[PDB]
Design a protein around this ligand. Sequence first.
Ligand SMILES: Nc1ncnc2c1ncn2[C@@H]1O[C@H](COP(=O)(O)OP(=O)(O)O)[C@@H](O)[C@H]1O
Ligand SMILES: Nc1ncnc2c1ncn2[C@@H]1O[C@H](COP(=O)(O)OP(=O)(O)O)[C@@H](O)[C@H]1O
Ligand SMILES: [Mg+2]
Ligand SMILES: [Mg+2]
Lengths: 337, 337
Amino acid sequence: RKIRVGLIFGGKSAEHEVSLQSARNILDALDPQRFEPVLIGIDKQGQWHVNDPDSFLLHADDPARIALHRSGRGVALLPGAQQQQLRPIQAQIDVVFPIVHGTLGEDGSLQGLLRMANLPFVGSGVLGSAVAMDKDMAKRVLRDARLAVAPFVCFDRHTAHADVDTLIAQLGLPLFVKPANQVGVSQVRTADAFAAALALALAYDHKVLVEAAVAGREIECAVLGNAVPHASVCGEVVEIVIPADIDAQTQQRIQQIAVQAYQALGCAGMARVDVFLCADGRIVINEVNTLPGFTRISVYPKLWQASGLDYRGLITRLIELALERHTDDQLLRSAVE
Amino acid sequence: RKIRVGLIFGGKSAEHEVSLQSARNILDALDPQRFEPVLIGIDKQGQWHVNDPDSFLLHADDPARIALHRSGRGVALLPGAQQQQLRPIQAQIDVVFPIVHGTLGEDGSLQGLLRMANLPFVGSGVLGSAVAMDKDMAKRVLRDARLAVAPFVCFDRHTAHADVDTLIAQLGLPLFVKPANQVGVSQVRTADAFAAALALALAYDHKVLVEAAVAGREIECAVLGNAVPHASVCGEVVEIVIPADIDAQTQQRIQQIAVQAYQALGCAGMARVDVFLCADGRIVINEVNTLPGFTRISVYPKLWQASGLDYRGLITRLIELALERHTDDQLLRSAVE
Ligand SMILES: Nc1ncnc2c1ncn2[C@@H]1O[C@H](COP(=O)(O)OP(=O)(O)O)[C@@H](O)[C@H]1O
Ligand SMILES: Nc1ncnc2c1ncn2[C@@H]1O[C@H](COP(=O)(O)OP(=O)(O)O)[C@@H](O)[C@H]1O
Ligand SMILES: [Mg+2]
Ligand SMILES: [Mg+2]
């Protein structure tokens, strides 16, 4: 009757601690009429630990020291299994809410594990996560959908044969140098600082984007839904200001763009879309993020709060969307001969 | 010293039996100086069974009855583990060669499981597999890379608001109706047969492509490699003819297109690229397939055979490429703070 929600959190990530705080907040807001929580923390070495709600954190109330209780109660996954798919090394989960920051948590890999275990789960599936996480691929698909993105060139080790001059002629200055995996970012103000930015970024990814500058205000907008996505009110990064000080017509066209970008990349459940709003009213997509923050101070939930969707209720909707997707997939999977 | 190769095969798939035959052939050709095999079969319900090389098939020599020995020796996966990641429910694998046909085996999901288990593995990673498998997404990325694809419209349940007339004005007749997941295909010769094709396809996927006809010969070309991919000689589907009866200049431009498509979609290890060669010499990409067949009669290995790469040696190269990728990823993963 109650649904069992497996919260998987942590990750090998600079944002590890953000995932800890999010898990705590989700746990406090989970509608206890409907959901029972099961907790799986992933430490900074990538090891999985089951915990109880009341002892999953060390120094919970100290932001500078908060950490995962590495209980050493390990987890096995049974691929192809239809029940008890998550097994203790040495509770049945009905839906997974993954908030694992870092490459594997965000890039479709964990999502693929969850599919292989036949687990419903919150957020974008394999494709949507993989595409959004790879900033090179995400921009090519956005571009093809006729949405505006910063002009850019993408390099790998084998082509980084980079001519700073041709780059400046095409893209200008300053240039933003980014590893394609959504640290290693640099604002290159002069042609001479480029070489080093290129080199730093390539320590983090096999692919590095070089982007022209976009002049404009930074507006962020929350999307929720599967096939019929909805958009929150906008927020302006000034340090966030909700609702953004922009007219109705402008908010509406950013909302519409956010939904369209989301559909193009094949997102589901949730994304935060970050755009630039230029002086002439052009809207340029900076980033589509399939794993927003879920702390009480994170932008994504505050954007929905300001749109009349409360935190408990956001969480409940994300779970319902995960179950909806799963049951629809169920029929199509079962159509194979 | 010897490398342990985990062969994972089978799958819930119409091509299940092709995967069985492939596994057998791979097993016979595996260089026993270098590799020891471990066998994991996935039955038609998606259940995983460990087997021994000498008893993994029922009716091995009868194509009409050949089936997986469902031994019931189950497999657990330890996510985050660095050793013994594949565990028997109730041999250390050093590299996985997945040839699991069907959605999960092909679409990045299994690849994501393998990443979560820190296993090196053969073929495209999560992104490359997810993108290539979704024919809608694959064509948009190809399109953006300025390679030619059949003109097309993509529908879901919520838009399939389909006007046959507008479709014929834009794309013509006949139309090819395809579920976006790479059965449910229909050649609609008249405007009146469309409705039903659209409806059949939508039983298999949430997305359905409608493509204009491409008039031309069918040429297939094998790609191998990670960052510097190579192309095989071409083969013509007449029923395959290797080498294709086409000039050197034409083979060279199809080879170049095959590599470019492969790079655009982020493929690794292996793909078979299928194109149309039109009367005027235009080359139109039909499909990039990240899981080709590996039977002795499959096109992919025959294309490499005709290019001077033998079957054992193809297999050895695919494993080397998997290990190369893995060790390079290793340094970048470990760069996180
Ligand atoms: N091409 C660009 N033009 C102008 N500003 C940029 C550009 N790329 C990044 N920035 C600015 O630098 C900041 C950091 O970049 P961003 O892509 O948001 O990386 P992350 O979200 O991983 O910090 C952005 O918030 C934006 O303010
Ligand atoms: N748009 C098209 N124009 C012309 N022929 C097509 C088109 N789409 C498919 N075909 C033909 O129909 C066959 C089946 O389509 P294909 O996409 O190869 O599906 P699958 O590989 O899953 O059978 C192809 O081998 C090709 O010969
Ligand atoms: Mg951003
Ligand atoms: Mg084909």
